[PDB]
Design an enzyme around this catalytic site. Structure first.
Site, PDB file in Angstrom:
ATOM      1  N   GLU A   1      -4.174  -8.372   7.181  1.00 30.33           N
ATOM      2  CA  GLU A   1      -5.337  -7.582   7.598  1.00 30.33           C
ATOM      3  C   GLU A   1      -4.962  -6.140   7.934  1.00 30.33           C
ATOM      4  O   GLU A   1      -5.233  -5.654   9.032  1.00 30.33           O
ATOM      5  CB  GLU A   1      -6.027  -8.220   8.810  1.00 30.33           C
ATOM      6  N   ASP A   2      -4.221  -5.509   7.019  1.00 31.67           N
ATOM      7  CA  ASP A   2      -3.924  -4.075   7.009  1.00 31.67           C
ATOM      8  C   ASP A   2      -2.956  -3.650   8.091  1.00 31.67           C
ATOM      9  O   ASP A   2      -2.971  -2.499   8.486  1.00 31.67           O
ATOM     10  CB  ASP A   2      -5.179  -3.201   7.079  1.00 31.67           C
ATOM     11  N   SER A   3      -2.126  -4.529   8.612  1.00 32.98           N
ATOM     12  CA  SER A   3      -0.980  -4.043   9.353  1.00 32.98           C
ATOM     13  C   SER A   3       0.237  -3.978   8.446  1.00 32.98           C
ATOM     14  O   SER A   3       0.156  -4.211   7.244  1.00 32.98           O
ATOM     15  CB  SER A   3      -0.707  -4.920  10.567  1.00 32.98           C
TER      16      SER A   3
END
Ligand SMILES: [Zn+2]
Ligand SMILES: [Zn+2]
Ligand SMILES: [Zn+2]
Lengths: 137, 45, 66, 113, 49, 47, 263
Positions: A1-3
């Site tokens: 999730e976009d880390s």
RNA sequence: GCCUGGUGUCUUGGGU
């Protein structure tokens, strides 16, 4: 999730490290013919409603010197205002922002257009990337 | 008392706050505090 | 600002090769060949020298503040 | 501000044992070994070695969270052997193989010197 | 605050009731809040800031 | 207490050799504001 | 039973083949050399004067990254384990640097060769900043122009790479095995034909290709591990491989000690 | 020898 996972050894060698600078400005205000604020290290005996932080990093001129590390709520510019009608003044000093730390880098002393004393204190610290910091391609 | 530095000609001198804020040498009105006597340490990390 | 001491990604020392790289460019070598002569074979090390921007030459021009 | 000290990965607090053995009484002859201030480096080395022994019936490990330098190993052996003793055997084997390995490198190194 | 204390966790805008659920605290180093990944959907949360 | 706000050097432990300032000296356990990382530590008086 | 065959060798890198060991042992050796082989590195910088254009901790940060000769570091103690009051000759090396530019023109470049060892645990060969030759000025630290001065005192300490990457003796560690993928540990991505689209390993000629008929040996294990250990000059390449093995031994020894004492 | 107060109203630029 976009880390993203960053290589800790790359951070150690200097990747995406940055300097951060903050400047504080203050000046003496005029309230009457000979009623002016005054830069000084305020004595606890003569000045009321002092701040809770330490005053022990100020020199005798009321200004902190470059090279001294500061932490939050430390006073870096001591200034008083007299109380109208001894034990006559009130503190009007400027503390460092509570969430910050670093080293005093440079202190400008001059006068403004009205002729009263005028100071600027620049503080520098270094911000090292850590969990939660934001990056983008 | 307190060491200062002239922003134009770099002469060093002291002032006991009541003196006017200028350089004795050139009259420049922008001056800077000299660094603390204390030693500064950094962890080189 | 100034050439990094180490390659960020692998750690090989590259801070002693900056002067040698500028001299090779005066002699007309191309960037790829200059890096080859310095034995910087992995492309992690190559980015460090090829893409550094030397700003310290600009900051020194500002006449010292003491 | 909330970064932990990096030296805490390998320096053991005084009230904290380097090693802790507890039983798993749910099945016969099974122990849980908690290793403090250690990594995959140590853990994977012991694990494979142990798995090639005929009297080890189960060996596994997990690093539960990378922000804490510990891991926990589970070791079950058949009725004859005591798990803790078997672990000592696995240790001594690897120390021997590395001693041999260090020797053979030294010899080969002088020839190329 | 200590392990297994319940706390109410919340992301704005609170569009429906599963924007506010009770989680059990686990104290950890570093300065972000940690969520198990399967709860990102009801909060309509992600980790871009 | 006569040692608050005075500069200090640490002679034992993992922070041995570092400069600091006594921020709070309640009893036996001092609070030194270390200079080197931006952290204030709890420390025993023997150190 | 473990065998080693050194393919190439020089002062700062050893290329070698490792064989008749388990995959896990080859990997643990890789990790140990990167992370746990002690070295010496600057860890405290006392700045008495810095009127250069670089910020104080910026210069200090570069100092920490300078590789120091760490040959005799095994006889040296960690600072955290020494019985003494503040530092002394047994747990630290003191280095000093002083540069200045006289003249109104030109630039004085401050190099790592100006780092002067002042004290140290004599007569152990530790603490000198590594040099390639004798005429090599070394690593650029700063640059100075007229009247700018840099006068610093550095304390170097023994440490390991787990704490901070400046203490690592390696740089990269190249590492590979099974160049023809006989073990089938990878499943190759391809557009048209997997063999033509994937380049050959640089050790493809050191092992023989799979025969076109040959059935899959489901009992074969990885058995030959080619690796190259490059170093920064803080330690010689042969020392790193030797001390990696040595360090890994004491760690296993320490585990063995604790079991026979807990009863 | 305990208590311990530092502004507001806007405007503008940003984050999801
Ligand atoms: Zn002047
Ligand atoms: Zn590289
Ligand atoms: Zn010592």
């Amino acid at each position: 999730e976009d880390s993203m996972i960053m290589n800790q050894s790359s951070i150690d060698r200097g990747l995406f490290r940055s300097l951060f600078f903050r400047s504080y400005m203050d000046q003496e205000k005029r309230f009457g013919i000979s009623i002016v604020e005054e830069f000084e290290k305020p004595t606890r005996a003569t000045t009321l409603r002092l701040k809770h932080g330490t005053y022990e990093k100020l020199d005798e001129d009321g200004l902190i010197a470059p090279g001294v590390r500061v932490s939050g709520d430390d006073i870096i510019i001591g200034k008083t205002t007299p109380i109208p009608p001894y034990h006559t003044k009130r503190d009007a000093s400027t503390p460092l922002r509570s969430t910050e730390n670093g080293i005093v880098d440079q202190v400008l002393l001059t006068t403004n257009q009205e002729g009263l004393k005028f100071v600027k204190v620049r503080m520098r610290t270094t911000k090292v990337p850590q969990i939660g910091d934001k990056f983008a391609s | 008392g307190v060491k200062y530095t002239c922003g134009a000609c770099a002469h060093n001198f002291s002032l006991n706050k009541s003196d006017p804020v200028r350089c004795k040498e050139c009259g420049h009105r922008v001056i800077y505090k000299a660094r603390t006597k204390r030693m500064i340490q950094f962890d080189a990390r | 600002m100034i050439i990094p001491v180490r390659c960020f990604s692998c750690g090989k020392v590259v801070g002693d090769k900056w002067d040698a790289y500028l001299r090779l460019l005066e002699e007309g070598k191309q960037e790829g060949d200059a890096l080859d002569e310095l034995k910087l074979k992995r492309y992690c090390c190559r980015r460090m020298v090829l893409t550094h921007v030397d700003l310290i030459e600009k900051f020194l021009r500002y006449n010292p503040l003491e | 501000m909330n970064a932990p000290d990096r030296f805490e990965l390998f320096i053991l607090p005084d009230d904290v044992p380097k090693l802790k053995i507890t039983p798993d009484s749910r099945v016969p002859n099974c122990i849980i070994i908690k290793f403090e201030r250690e990594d995959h480096t140590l853990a994977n080395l012991l694990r494979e070695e142990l798995a090639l022994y005929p009297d080890v019936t189960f060996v596994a490990y997990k690093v539960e969270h990378p922000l804490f330098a510990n891991f926990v190993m589970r070791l079950q052996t058949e009725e004859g052997t005591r798990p803790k003793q078997a672990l000592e055997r696995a240790c001594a084997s690897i120390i021997n193989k590395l001693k041999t390995l260090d020797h053979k490198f030294n010899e080969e190194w002088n020839i190329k010197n | 605050l200590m392990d297994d204390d319940p706390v109410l966790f919340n992301r704005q805008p609170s569009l429906h009731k599963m924007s506010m659920m009770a989680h059990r605290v686990k104290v950890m180093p570093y300065s972000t809040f940690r969520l198990n990944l399967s709860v990102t959907s009801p909060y309509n949360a992600d980790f871009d800031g | 207490d006569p040692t608050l706000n005075k500069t200090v050097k640490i002679r034992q432990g993992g922070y041995k050799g570092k400069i600091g300032i006594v921020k709070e000296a309640n009893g036996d356990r001092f609070r030194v504001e270390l200079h080197n990382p931006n952290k204030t530590i709890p420390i025993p008086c023997s150190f | 039973e473990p065998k080693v065959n050194i393919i190439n060798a020089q002062d700062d890198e050893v290329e070698l083949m490792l064989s008749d060991v388990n995959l896990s042992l080859a990997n643990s050796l890789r990790r140990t050399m990167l992370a746990e082989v002690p070295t010496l590195a600057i860890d405290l910088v006392e700045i008495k004067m810095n009127t250069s254009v670089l910020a104080d901790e910026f210069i200090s940060h570069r100092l920490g990254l300078i590789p120091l000769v760490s040959e005799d570091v095994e006889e040296m103690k960690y600072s955290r384990d020494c019985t003494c009051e503040d530092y002394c000759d047994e747990c630290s090396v003191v280095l000093e640097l002083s540069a200045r530019h006289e003249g109104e023109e030109g630039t004085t470049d401050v190099y790592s060769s100006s780092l002067i060892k002042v004290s140290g645990p004599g007569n152990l060969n530790v603490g000198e900043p590594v040099r390639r030759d004798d005429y090599d000025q070394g690593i650029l630290l700063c640059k100075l122009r007229n009247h700018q001065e840099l006068n610093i005192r550095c304390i170097a300490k023994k440490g390991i790479a787990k704490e901070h990457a400046k203490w690592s003796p390696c740089s990269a560690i190249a590492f590979e095995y099974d160049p023809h993928n006989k073990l089938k540990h990878t499943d190759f991505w391809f557009e048209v034909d997997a063999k033509k689209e994937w380049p050959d390993s640089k050790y493809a000629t050191w092992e023989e290709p799979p025969k076109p008929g040959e059935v899959f040996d489901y009992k074969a294990k990885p058995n030959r591990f080619y690796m190259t250990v490059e170093t920064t000059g803080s330690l010689k390449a042969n020392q790193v491989f030797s001390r990696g093995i040595k360090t890994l031994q004491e760690k296993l020894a320490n585990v063995l000690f604790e079991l026979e004492n807990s009863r």
